[PDB]
Amino acid sequence: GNPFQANVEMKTFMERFNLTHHHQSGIYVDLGQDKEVDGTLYREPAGLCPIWGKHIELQQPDRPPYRNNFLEDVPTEKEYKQSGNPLPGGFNLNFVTPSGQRISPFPMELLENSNIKASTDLGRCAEFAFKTVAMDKNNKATKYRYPFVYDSKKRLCHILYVSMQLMEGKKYCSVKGEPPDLTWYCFKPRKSVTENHHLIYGSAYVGENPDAFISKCPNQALRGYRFGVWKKGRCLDYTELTDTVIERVESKAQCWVKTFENDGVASDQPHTYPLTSQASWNDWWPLHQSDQPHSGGVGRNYGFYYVDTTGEGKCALSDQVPDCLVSDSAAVSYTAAGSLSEETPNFIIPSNTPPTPETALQCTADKFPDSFGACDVQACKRQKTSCVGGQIQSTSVDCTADEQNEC
Ligand SMILES: *[C@@H]1O[C@H](CO)[C@@H](O)[C@H](O)[C@H]1NC(C)=O
């Protein structure tokens, strides 16, 4: 009797944390699909959940004309003639309509318009991205869809022409202008303990069903609980699992960053990039490669900050999809997909469309009596499930004096 499985409301709550199920693609680098454009096969971001706080850190020279900001416009041919190597600018789609209307960034007020069906601001930007496709050379609508960033502060929706997310090595690219002959600067995905929390990155496919992310993706940190897996008749938090990575942290936010940046996070990036005959890297989109990985969202995406009995702040990282929780008011559970904050921001609350509940961890002492599992005689602990201040509690406690003879 895992209560988190036996209770269908608690079960459906825990499902939001399964990134392999809903997101289904890379998170650190998302390149989960393939689409041909003008006779060439390109990798395309495909994941269904927004990645909160994800930004691409660029490594352009530290001088004019370089902004080191992936939200800047992709450069014009002239701009690049003027700058020298490497390319200046950013990843932002710079196209104009025949009318001369700019496509990105696009303001949320203009979206909130009946061609846009999403009920939340973040969903409206995802839906905009989903309704925006590469046009081929000739000029026809293609199936390749650009990823987006919602800058939730400025309320602006960015369609990124550049769908590349990681490029490293003097093979392909320069770091702060060294070596100088290379066309591309290097870049990589980051989250920061302090910056760009108000930026949300996503594949266009978050917009295909633009309200689904609200209730199927783990958007927000989970305060007051530690991710766990049901074993031996009780909830074992990640600290009790053999394959967990445990690192010391100074702060809870560093743990949140580590769930995205650790070496085992779900990533669709190949270890060597494609064999071309170009001098170096020379495309706006990643090329299809026979041996490309598709993580399908599987990876060390999960973790929690907690304080050990020694008083040290630590971060437990796991690839194990959680199917239970251990309650701990000081703990916070994070994923590679969600935000640092545990509070639901305004811009994923229907602007109109009732808010979907998560009432699954609410309880009453009356209807939810103290319940004890059987003693795990290996650890000599047993599950205790109960209700305190209207919140479900789940911990491992001492076995009865009698059961201890069997440990
Ligand atoms: C997570 O989702 C994937 C794909 O649907 C599934 O294979 C896996 O069992 C799920 N894990 C759970 C519920 O622990």
What does this structure look like?
The structure is a monomer. The protein is α+β, with helices and mostly antiparallel strands and 407 residues long. The chain folds into three domains: 1-16 and 220-262 and 302-336, Hepatocyte Growth Factor; 32-219, no CATH class; 361-407, Complement Module, domain 1, CATH 2.10.70.70. It is 13% helix and 26% strand. It has helices spanning 3-6, 8-15, 77-83, 108-111, 121-130, 213-216, 252-261, 401-404, and strands at residues 33-37, 40-44, 51-52, 55-58, 106-107, 133-135, 141-145, 148-151, 156-159, 173-174, 184-185, 187-190, 199-202, 222-231, 234-237, 245-248, 302-307, 313-318, 324-335, 371-372, 381-388, 391-398. The longest helix is centred in the first third of the chain and has 10 residues, at 121-130. The two termini are 21 Å apart. Bound molecules: 2-acetamido-2-deoxy-beta-D-glucopyranose. The site of 2-acetamido-2-deoxy-beta-D-glucopyranose has 5 residues, from loops. Disulfide bonds join 49-217, 125-157, 173-186, 235-324, 255-315, 363-387, 375-399, 380-407. Residues 347-407 are annotated as: DIII. Residues 1-407 are extracellular.
Topology of this protein?
Layout: H1 3-6, H2 8-15, E1 33-37, E2 40-44, E3 51-52, E4 55-58, H3 77-83, E5 106-107, H4 108-111, H5 121-130, E6 133-135, E7 141-145, E8 148-151, E9 156-159, E10 173-174, E11 184-185, E12 187-190, E13 199-202, H6 213-216, E14 222-231, E15 234-237, E16 245-248, H7 252-261, E17 302-307, E18 313-318, E19 324-335, E20 371-372, E21 381-388, E22 391-398, H8 401-404
Parallel strand pairs: 10-11
Antiparallel strand pairs: 1-2, 3-13, 4-12, 5-9, 6-7, 8-9, 8-13, 14-15, 14-19, 16-18, 17-18, 17-19, 20-21, 21-22
The chain binds 2-acetamido-2-deoxy-beta-D-glucopyranose (NAG).
Residues 18, 20-21, 321, 323 line the site of 2-acetamido-2-deoxy-beta-D-glucopyranose.
